[PDB]
Design a protein around this motif. Structure first.
Motif, mmCIF file in Angstrom:
data_model
loop_
_atom_site.group_PDB
_atom_site.id
_atom_site.type_symbol
_atom_site.label_atom_id
_atom_site.label_comp_id
_atom_site.label_asym_id
_atom_site.label_seq_id
_atom_site.Cartn_x
_atom_site.Cartn_y
_atom_site.Cartn_z
ATOM 1 N N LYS A 18 0.825 -1.204 0.000
ATOM 2 C CA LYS A 18 0.000 0.000 0.000
ATOM 3 C C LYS A 18 0.862 1.259 0.000
ATOM 4 N N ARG A 19 1.915 1.306 0.817
ATOM 5 C CA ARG A 19 2.697 2.544 0.812
ATOM 6 C C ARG A 19 3.521 2.672 -0.466
ATOM 7 N N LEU A 20 3.989 1.551 -1.025
ATOM 8 C CA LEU A 20 4.662 1.592 -2.322
ATOM 9 C C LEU A 20 3.740 2.142 -3.408
ATOM 10 N N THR A 21 2.536 1.581 -3.538
ATOM 11 C CA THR A 21 1.665 2.006 -4.638
ATOM 12 C C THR A 21 1.089 3.398 -4.398
ATOM 13 N N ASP A 22 0.846 3.770 -3.137
ATOM 14 C CA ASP A 22 0.489 5.156 -2.822
ATOM 15 C C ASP A 22 1.558 6.134 -3.317
ATOM 16 N N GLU A 23 2.832 5.813 -3.060
ATOM 17 C CA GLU A 23 3.934 6.652 -3.528
ATOM 18 C C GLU A 23 3.967 6.716 -5.050
ATOM 19 N N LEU A 24 3.755 5.577 -5.722
ATOM 20 C CA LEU A 24 3.742 5.582 -7.187
ATOM 21 C C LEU A 24 2.648 6.497 -7.710
ATOM 22 N N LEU A 25 1.425 6.300 -7.222
ATOM 23 C CA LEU A 25 0.300 7.071 -7.735
ATOM 24 C C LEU A 25 0.487 8.560 -7.463
ATOM 25 N N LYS A 26 1.021 8.915 -6.295
ATOM 26 C CA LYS A 26 1.199 10.326 -5.969
ATOM 27 C C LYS A 26 2.304 10.971 -6.787
ATOM 28 N N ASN A 27 3.107 10.167 -7.481
ATOM 29 C CA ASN A 27 4.119 10.661 -8.402
ATOM 30 C C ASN A 27 3.776 10.323 -9.848
ATOM 31 N N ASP A 28 2.488 10.088 -10.129
ATOM 32 C CA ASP A 28 1.964 9.933 -11.490
ATOM 33 C C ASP A 28 2.577 8.740 -12.221
ATOM 34 N N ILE A 29 2.861 7.660 -11.487
ATOM 35 C CA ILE A 29 3.331 6.399 -12.063
ATOM 36 C C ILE A 29 2.237 5.344 -11.924
ATOM 37 N N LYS A 30 1.867 4.719 -13.038
ATOM 38 C CA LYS A 30 0.832 3.681 -13.042
ATOM 39 C C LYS A 30 1.398 2.345 -12.567
ATOM 40 N N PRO A 31 0.848 1.741 -11.515
ATOM 41 C CA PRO A 31 1.376 0.453 -11.041
ATOM 42 C C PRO A 31 0.884 -0.710 -11.891
ATOM 43 N N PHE A 32 1.812 -1.600 -12.259
ATOM 44 C CA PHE A 32 1.515 -2.901 -12.863
ATOM 45 C C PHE A 32 2.044 -3.966 -11.913
ATOM 46 N N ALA A 33 1.157 -4.757 -11.314
ATOM 47 C CA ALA A 33 1.561 -5.675 -10.252
ATOM 48 C C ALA A 33 1.571 -7.101 -10.776
ATOM 49 N N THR A 34 2.740 -7.749 -10.718
ATOM 50 C CA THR A 34 2.852 -9.187 -10.934
ATOM 51 C C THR A 34 2.549 -9.918 -9.630
ATOM 52 N N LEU A 39 -5.990 -4.201 -2.520
ATOM 53 C CA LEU A 39 -5.251 -3.251 -3.346
ATOM 54 C C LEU A 39 -6.012 -2.763 -4.570
ATOM 55 N N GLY A 40 -7.259 -3.198 -4.765
ATOM 56 C CA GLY A 40 -7.995 -2.816 -5.962
ATOM 57 C C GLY A 40 -8.156 -1.317 -6.135
ATOM 58 N N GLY A 41 -8.188 -0.572 -5.038
ATOM 59 C CA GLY A 41 -8.209 0.870 -5.175
ATOM 60 C C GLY A 41 -6.884 1.482 -5.566
ATOM 61 N N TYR A 42 -5.800 0.708 -5.487
ATOM 62 C CA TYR A 42 -4.443 1.183 -5.735
ATOM 63 C C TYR A 42 -3.910 0.744 -7.095
ATOM 64 N N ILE A 43 -4.251 -0.474 -7.510
ATOM 65 C CA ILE A 43 -3.675 -1.151 -8.666
ATOM 66 C C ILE A 43 -4.807 -1.526 -9.611
ATOM 67 N N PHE A 82 -11.073 -12.603 -10.459
ATOM 68 C CA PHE A 82 -11.001 -11.221 -10.920
ATOM 69 C C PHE A 82 -12.294 -10.812 -11.607
ATOM 70 N N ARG A 83 -12.776 -11.654 -12.522
ATOM 71 C CA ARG A 83 -13.988 -11.313 -13.260
ATOM 72 C C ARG A 83 -15.193 -11.239 -12.334
ATOM 73 N N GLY A 84 -15.243 -12.104 -11.316
ATOM 74 C CA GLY A 84 -16.348 -12.065 -10.374
ATOM 75 C C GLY A 84 -16.388 -10.802 -9.543
ATOM 76 N N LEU A 85 -15.240 -10.161 -9.347
ATOM 77 C CA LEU A 85 -15.209 -8.933 -8.563
ATOM 78 C C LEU A 85 -15.701 -7.740 -9.360
ATOM 79 N N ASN A 86 -15.530 -7.804 -10.676
ATOM 80 C CA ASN A 86 -15.910 -6.757 -11.612
ATOM 81 C C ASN A 86 -15.408 -5.391 -11.138
ATOM 82 N N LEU A 87 -14.095 -5.331 -10.937
ATOM 83 C CA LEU A 87 -13.425 -4.134 -10.443
ATOM 84 C C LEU A 87 -13.433 -3.044 -11.507
ATOM 85 N N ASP A 88 -13.769 -1.820 -11.098
ATOM 86 C CA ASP A 88 -13.895 -0.721 -12.050
ATOM 87 C C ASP A 88 -12.567 -0.469 -12.746
ATOM 88 N N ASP A 89 -12.592 -0.485 -14.083
ATOM 89 C CA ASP A 89 -11.478 0.001 -14.896
ATOM 90 C C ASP A 89 -10.191 -0.752 -14.581
#
Ligand code: NA
Ligand code: NA
Ligand code: NA
Ligand code: NA
Ligand code: NA
Length: 444
Positions: free
Chosen positions: A99-115, A151-155, A205-212
């Motif tokens: 969460k703190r890693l992806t928060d930092e990415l988003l706040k610096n305009d970097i799109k996270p791609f999580a493996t 993490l769906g709100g982050y990634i 993943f499909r069952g969650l139907n996460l926005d975008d």
């Protein structure tokens, strides 16, 4: 007016065990790679990822460094042994790091791609059979579901597996990678359970139907050339191509293992894991395919043994891995996917890069002109694919920084940033400065 549109993603990539360190902190338990690197003879000079780049503690500096390069997307992996350090035992402290890693990415305009899985299987899972135990499909599903929910709100961009060819054949047949078995039948069954686990995550993943939010998988692909126009070498290349590429492309995108490889492998090991229900789960529609591309192979028939093609050296320039620098195969593979497997589906290059003999000179710089030229040649092929109608959405350079290169330890340096491991200092190589200019100008 731009070779790469404003929406095209210029990225860089890492993986959790290769960079994070902090291997025994905040609840993390051992992975199969912590264990494997401690076995005599398995990893160069007994290197391990205890500390690696110390990215776990330095992640704010590393995000600031990507922001200053203009990086638009960052591919990283999530360490299963931080999230579930014991079977069924969720570790919020592990999730808090991502969460703190992806928060930092988003706040610096970097799109996270999580493996989700980049080879650091928890030791507790291997002790229960690992990828050889079909129950892993549920363990992996529970892990992926926890990531999607927390993490769906982050990634919004998810990759189920990295390079299942490595986790199966290189880990269970050739034995170079963890857990280091040498049994063709085991590697084949592992390949199936990996793909089935991918399928379970896609179902969840499909069952969650996460926005975008989008999900895909990452495959290391090459292009195989026969050494001559002989029948012997054509069959040799067909087998080599089936072993590396079609064994994974066909079940994923055709719903069927390649029959020539099923019959070929069947002469040496059991292939009774194949069934309709599993292939339906394996072949669920994806949002994108990630391509890891490094090199080609030129192969000559060997001595009629199992997978015994002779590797031909065509006499061209190579990296410190011994890998031919052959940028045209990047275009050829992307085109092959467009014409034979993925059609109009979005593609990402999720890894491309090179290891060279990098030295910090007396001026404090790393003048890695061979890597500048390597990346330049390969981005030119990405541009040619785009201009020929290919659906390429982004390109992740392997790697952001020098790191733990698996069985090679720290002896192979892939970064556009040099890491002095004694001090953990980061030094931008000339390739990073070149890449910064590419992102800014979007011209090549
Ligand atoms: Na590590
Ligand atoms: Na070690
Ligand atoms: Na698909
Ligand atoms: Na997509
Ligand atoms: Na080429």
């Amino acid at each position: 007016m731009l070779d790469f549109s404003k929406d095209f993603l210029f990225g860089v990539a890492t993986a959790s065990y290769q960079v994070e360190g902090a291997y025994n902190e905040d609840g993390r338990t051992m992975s199969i790679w912590d264990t494997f690197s401690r076995q005599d003879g398995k990893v160069y000079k007994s290197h391990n990822g205890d500390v690696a780049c110390d990215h776990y503690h330095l992640y704010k500096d590393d995000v600031k460094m990507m922001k200053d390069l203009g990086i638009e997307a960052y591919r990283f992996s999530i360490a299963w042994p931080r999230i579930f350090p014991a079977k069924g035992q969720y570790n919020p402290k592990g999730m808090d790091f991502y969460k703190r890693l992806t928060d930092e990415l988003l706040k610096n305009d970097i799109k996270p791609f999580a493996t989700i899985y980049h080879w650091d299987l928890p030791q507790w899972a291997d002790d229960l059979g690992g990828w050889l135990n079909r129950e892993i499909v549920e363990w992996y599903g529970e892990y992926a579901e926890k990531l999607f929910s927390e993490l769906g709100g982050y990634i919004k961009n998810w990759i189920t597996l990295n390079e299942p060819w490595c986790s199966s054949f290189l880990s269970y047949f050739i034995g170079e990678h963890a857990p280091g078995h040498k049994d063709l039948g085991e590697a084949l069954l592992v390949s199936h359970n990996l793909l089935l686990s991918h399928g379970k995550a896609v179902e969840i993943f499909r069952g969650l139907n996460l926005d975008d939010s989008k999900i895909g998988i990452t495959l290391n692909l090459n292009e195989v050339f026969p050494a001559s126009d002989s029948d012997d070498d054509k069959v040799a290349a067909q087998i080599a191509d089936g072993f590396q590429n079609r064994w994974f492309l066909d079940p994923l995108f055709k719903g069927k293992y390649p029959q020539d490889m099923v019959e070929y492998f069947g002469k040496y090991a059991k292939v009774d894991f194949i069934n309709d229900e599993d292939l339906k789960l394996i072949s669920q529609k994806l949002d994108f395919l990630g391509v890891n591309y490094y090199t080609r192979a030129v192969v000559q028939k060997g001595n009629d043994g199992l997978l015994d093609a002779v590797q031909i050296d065509p006499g061209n320039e190579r990296t410190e891995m011994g890998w031919e620098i052959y940028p045209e195969s990047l275009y050829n593979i992307l085109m092959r996917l467009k014409r034979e497997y993925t059609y109009d589906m979005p593609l990402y290059i999720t890894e491309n890069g090179a290891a060279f003999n990098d030295v910090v000179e007396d001026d404090g710089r790393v003048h890695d002109e061979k890597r500048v030229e390597f990346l330049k040649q390969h981005f030119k092929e990405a541009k040619r694919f785009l201009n020929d109608g290919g659906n390429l959405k982004g390109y992740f350079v392997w790697s952001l920084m020098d790191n733990f290169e698996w069985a090679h330890g720290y002896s192979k340096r892939f970064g556009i940033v040099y890491v002095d491991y004694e001090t953990e200092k980061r030094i931008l190589k000339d390739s990073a400065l070149w890449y910064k200019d590419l992102i800014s100008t979007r011209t090549i």
